[PDB]
Amino acid sequence: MLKRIKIVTSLLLVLAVFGLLQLTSGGLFFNALKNDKENFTVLQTIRQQQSTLNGSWVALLQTRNTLNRAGIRYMMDQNNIGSGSTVAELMESASISLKQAEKNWADYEALPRDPRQSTAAAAEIKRNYDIYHNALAELIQLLGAGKINEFFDQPTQGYQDGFEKQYVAYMEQNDRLHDIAVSDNNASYSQAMWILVGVMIVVLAVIFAVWFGIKASLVAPMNRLIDSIRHIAGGDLVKPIEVDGSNEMGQLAESLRH
Amino acid sequence: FAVWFGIKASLVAPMNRLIDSIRHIAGGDLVKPIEVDGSNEMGQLAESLRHMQGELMRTVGDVRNGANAIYSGASEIATGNNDLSSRTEQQAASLEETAASME
Amino acid sequence: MLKRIKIVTSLLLVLAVFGLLQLTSGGLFFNALKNDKENFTVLQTIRQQQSTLNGSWVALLQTRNTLNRAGIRYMMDQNNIGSGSTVAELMESASISLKQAEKNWADYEALPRDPRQSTAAAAEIKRNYDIYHNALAELIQLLGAGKINEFFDQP
C-alpha cells in the first residue's frame, strides 16, 4: 500500500511510469525505423545488381549482334552485294562490346550479395557466363582468321539460351525476394500501428486509474485532517483521529492527536 | 523532473511547516506565526490552523484573566477573615472582661 | 510557475501532456514509416516497369538475333553449305520472340504511373518501340519474299 511510503515518492513513480512507457515504446519504433532502413539498404543493393547485370547481359547481346553483322558482312563480300562498314570495323565493335560485358560484370562481383540469395543459383549464372563469355571471345578469333565455315558450326546458340534461363531465373529470383522486402515494410508499418493503438489504450487506461490513486493518497487524507481542525476548533472533541501510515499525513495526525 | 521539483516545493515544505506548527502549538507555544499561500489544499489547512490557534489564545487568555480574579478575590476574603478573626478575639475578650466586671 | 494552480490541477494537466506526446511522437514515427510505405509503392512499381521493359527489350534483341540466323541460313542454302534447321523454322522462332515483346510490353502499359516519373521519357521510349517493332515485322516479309539483298540494307 502507499501508506508505507511518502506521497512525493509515489508521484515520482507515477510520472516514471509514463517516462518508462515512452522509452520502452520509443525503443520499439527505433527498431522499426532501423529494420525499415535495412529494407531500403537491401532493396538498394538488389537494384544495383540488376543494373550492373543488365548492362552485362545487354553487352553479350550487343556483342552477338555485331558478330552476326560481321559474319553476314563477310559473306556478302564473297558474292559482292552492295557495300558498307568493313569487317574490321564490325569486329572492332564486338571487341568494345565484349569489354563492356566484363566491366558491367565486374561491378556485379563487387556489389555485396544478400544472405537470403540462393548460393547455387549464383554459381550457375557465373558458370554459364564464363562459357558464354569465352564463346563470344572465340568467335572473334575464328572470323578474323577466315574460318567462316566453322563460324556457324559452333554451340554458341546453346550457350546463349543457357545463360538466358539463368538470367531470367536470376531476375525472377530478385523479383520474389523484392516482394519479401516489401513484406518487411508492411511488418514494420503494421507494428507501428499496433504499438501506437496499443500503447495509447494502455496510457489512457493508466491515466484513468491515476486519478483515483491521487485522490486515494492525497485529496482523501488531506481533507480528513482539514475537517478535523474544524471540529477541534468548533468544540467537538469526540471524533477520534486515525493515523495514515508513516507519511506526512500520518505525522500530522499523530501530532494533532497530542 | 520539473514537475517533481515543483510539487516538492509546493507539498513537502508547506506540509512540513504545518506539521511542525501543530507540534509547537501542541506543546504550548502559541507564538509561531502562520501564513497562507493560495486557496489550494495546503491553503485551507493553514487557514484552518490559524483559526484553531486563535481559540487557544482566547481560551488560555480568558482563563488566565479569570483565574487571577479568583486568586485575587479569594485573597480579599482570606485577608478579611484574618482581620475579622483578630477583631473577633478582641470582642471575645471583652465578654470575659465584661462578665468578670458584672461579678 | 506551478504555484498559480493546485496540486491536483497540475497533475491532471501533466497527465494530458503525456497522452499528447505519445500520440504526436507515435504519429511522427508512424508517419515516417507511412512515407516509407509510399516509397515501396513506387519501388514495387519501378521493378515491374524495368522487369517488363527488360523482358521486352531482351525479346527485341533475341528477335533480331533470330532473324540474323535466318538470313545466314537462307544464303547458305543458295550456295549449298552444310545443313540444319530450315528457314521456315528460324522465321517462326523470330515470330514467337516478337510476340514475347508484345506480351511483356503489354503489361508495361497497364502498370501504374507515379507522378515523379519523367512523362517525356515514357513517350520517347515508346516512339522508338513502335518504330522498332514495325521494323522487325517488316523483316519477316522481306525475307520471305526473297529480298535477301534489301534485308541487310534496312534501317
Q: Which residues of C touch B6 (CB under 8 A)?
A: 2-3, 10
Cell of C89: 523454322
Cell of C51: 522487369
Angle at A159 between CA C82 and CA C106, to 5 degrees: 105
Q: What is the C-alpha separation between C74 and C143, in angstroms, rounded?
A: 9
Residues with Cβ within 8 Å of C95's Cβ and at least 6 positions away in sequence, in order, are C140
Do A42 and A114 meet the contact criterion of CB atoms below 8 Å apart? Answer: yes
Q: What is the C-alpha separation between A139 and A64, in angstroms, rounded?
A: 9
Which of A43, A168, A214 lies nearest to residue C43, judging by beta carbons?
A: A43
Resolution of the model in angstroms: 12.0
Q: What is the C-alpha separation between A147 and A143, in angstroms, rounded?
A: 6
Q: What is the C-alpha separation between A213 and C8, in angstroms, rounded?
A: 11
Do A12 and B4 meet the contact criterion of CB atoms below 8 Å apart? Answer: yes
- How far does the CA of residue C18 sit from the closest CA of chain A (Å)? 7
Q: What is the C-alpha separation between C62 and C100, in angstroms, rounded?
A: 10
Residues with Cβ within 8 Å of A210's Cβ and at least 6 positions away in sequence, in order, are A14, C11, C15
- Which helix (H) or strand (E) is B14 found in, with range? helix B13-27
Per DSSP, the three-state class of C5 is coil
- C-alpha pair distances (Å), A237 with each of A181, A220, A230: 78, 21, 10
Which of B19, B23, B48 lies nearest to residue A226, judging by beta carbons?
A: B48
Question: What burial class does residue A232 get, using C-beta atoms within 10 Å of its C-beta: 0-12 exposed, 13-18 middle, 19+ buried?
Answer: middle
Q: Which residues of B touch C7 (CB under 8 A)?
A: 7, 10-11, 40-42
Which of C7, C25, C65 lies nearest to residue A61, judging by beta carbons?
A: C65
Contact between A29 and C29 using a beta-carbon 8 Å cutoff: yes
Residues with Cβ within 8 Å of A45's Cβ and at least 6 positions away in sequence, in order, are A111, A112, A114
Do C10 and A152 meet the contact criterion of CB atoms below 8 Å apart? Answer: no
- C-alpha pair distances (Å), A5 with each of A211, A245, A256: 18, 8, 20
Cell of A80: 559482292
Length of chain B: 103
* Torsion sign (Cα): A182, A186, A187, A188: positive
Q: Which residues of B touch A (CB under 8 A)?
A: 3-4, 7-8, 11-12, 15-16, 18-19, 22-23, 26, 41, 44-45, 48-49, 51-52, 55
- How far does the CA of residue B55 sit from the closest CA of chain A (Å)? 7
Interface of C with B in 13-52 (CB under 8 A): 14
Q: What is the C-alpha separation between C129 and C124, in angstroms, rounded?
A: 9
Contact between C8 and A219 using a beta-carbon 8 Å cutoff: yes
- How far does the CA of residue C45 sit from the closest CA of chain B (Å)? 50
Q: Count chain A–chain C contacts defined by CB atoms under 8 A.
A: 127
Question: What burial class does residue B2 get, using C-beta atoms within 10 Å of its C-beta: 0-12 exposed, 13-18 middle, 19+ buried?
Answer: exposed
Cell of C141: 516479309
* Torsion sign (Cα): A153, A155, A161, A167: negative
Question: What burial class does residue C2 get, using C-beta atoms within 10 Å of its C-beta: 0-12 exposed, 13-18 middle, 19+ buried?
Answer: middle
Q: What is the C-alpha separation between B24 and B27, in angstroms, rounded?
A: 5
Method of determination used here: cryo-EM
Do A215 and C9 meet the contact criterion of CB atoms below 8 Å apart? Answer: no
- C-alpha pair distances (Å), B85 with each of B72, B78, B97, C17: 20, 10, 19, 88
- Which helix (H) or strand (E) is B44 found in, with range? helix B41-102
- C-alpha pair distances (Å), A136 with each of A64, C40, C70: 7, 39, 19
Cell of B26: 501542541
Question: What burial class does residue A93 get, using C-beta atoms within 10 Å of its C-beta: 0-12 exposed, 13-18 middle, 19+ buried?
Answer: middle
Interrupted backbone of chain A, residues before each interruption (C–N > 2.5 Å): none
- Following DSSP, what letter does each residue of A86-151 receive, concatenated? -HHHHHHHHHHHHHHHHHHHHHHHHSPPPTTS-HHHHHHHHHHHHHHHHHHHHHHHHHHHT-HHHH
DSSP C109: T
Q: What is the C-alpha separation between B45 and B48, in angstroms, rounded?
A: 5
Name the residue with cell 522486402: A181
Phi-psi region of B94 (alpha: psi -120 to 50; beta: other; left: phi over 0): alpha
Q: Which subunits have 3 or more CB–CB pairs within 8 Å of chain A? A: B, C
Which stretches within chain A are classed as H helix?
A: 7-79, 87-110, 119-145, 148-151, 156-214, 220-234, 248-257
Contact between B15 and A255 using a beta-carbon 8 Å cutoff: no
Question: B5-24: string of b/e by CB count within 10 Å (b at 16+)?
Answer: ebbeebbeebbeebbebbbe
Do B45 and A225 meet the contact criterion of CB atoms below 8 Å apart? Answer: yes
Using alpha carbons, select from C43, C28, C18, C42 the residue that is nearest to residue A32. C28
Cell of C64: 533480331
* Torsion sign (Cα): C21, C22, C27, C30: positive
Which stretches within chain C are classed as H helix?
A: 7-79, 87-108, 119-144, 148-151
Q: How many alpha carbons lie under 13 Å from residue C3 in its C-beta half-sphere?
A: 9
Do A57 and A132 meet the contact criterion of CB atoms below 8 Å apart? Answer: no
Contact between B18 and A255 using a beta-carbon 8 Å cutoff: no
Using alpha carbons, select from A175, A168, A81, A163 the residue that is nearest to residue A130. A163
Do A212 and A1 meet the contact criterion of CB atoms below 8 Å apart? Answer: no
Name the residue with cell 497540475: C10
Q: What is the C-alpha separation between A257 and A243, in angstroms, rounded?
A: 9
- How far does the CA of residue B76 sit from the closest CA of chain C (Å)? 60
Using alpha carbons, select from C97, C88, C65, C92 the residue that is nearest to residue A68. C65
Residues with Cβ within 8 Å of C32's Cβ and at least 6 positions away in sequence, in order, are A33
Using alpha carbons, select from B78, B59, B41, C148 the residue that is nearest to residue A76. C148
Q: Which subunits have 3 or more CB–CB pairs within 8 Å of chain C? A: A, B
Per DSSP, the three-state class of B39 is coil
Q: What is the C-alpha separation between A206 and A47, in angstroms, rounded?
A: 47
Q: Which subunits have 3 or more CB–CB pairs within 8 Å of chain B? A: A, C
Q: Which residues of B touch A226 (CB under 8 A)?
A: 41, 44-45, 48
User: Count of CB atoms within 10 A of residue B99's CB?
Assistant: 9
Using alpha carbons, select from A189, A144, A193, A167 the residue that is nearest to residue A60. A167
Q: What is the C-alpha separation between A151 and A143, in angstroms, rounded?
A: 7
Per DSSP, the three-state class of C2 is helix
User: Count of CB atoms within 10 A of residue A182's CB?
Assistant: 18
Q: What is the C-alpha separation between A189 and C30, in angstroms, rounded?
A: 7
Residues with Cβ within 8 Å of C123's Cβ and at least 6 positions away in sequence, in order, are none
Torsion, Cα A207 A208 A211 A214, to 10 degrees, reads -60
Nearest residue of B to residue C1 by CA position? B6
Q: How many alpha carbons lie under 13 Å from residue C93 in its C-beta half-sphere?
A: 16
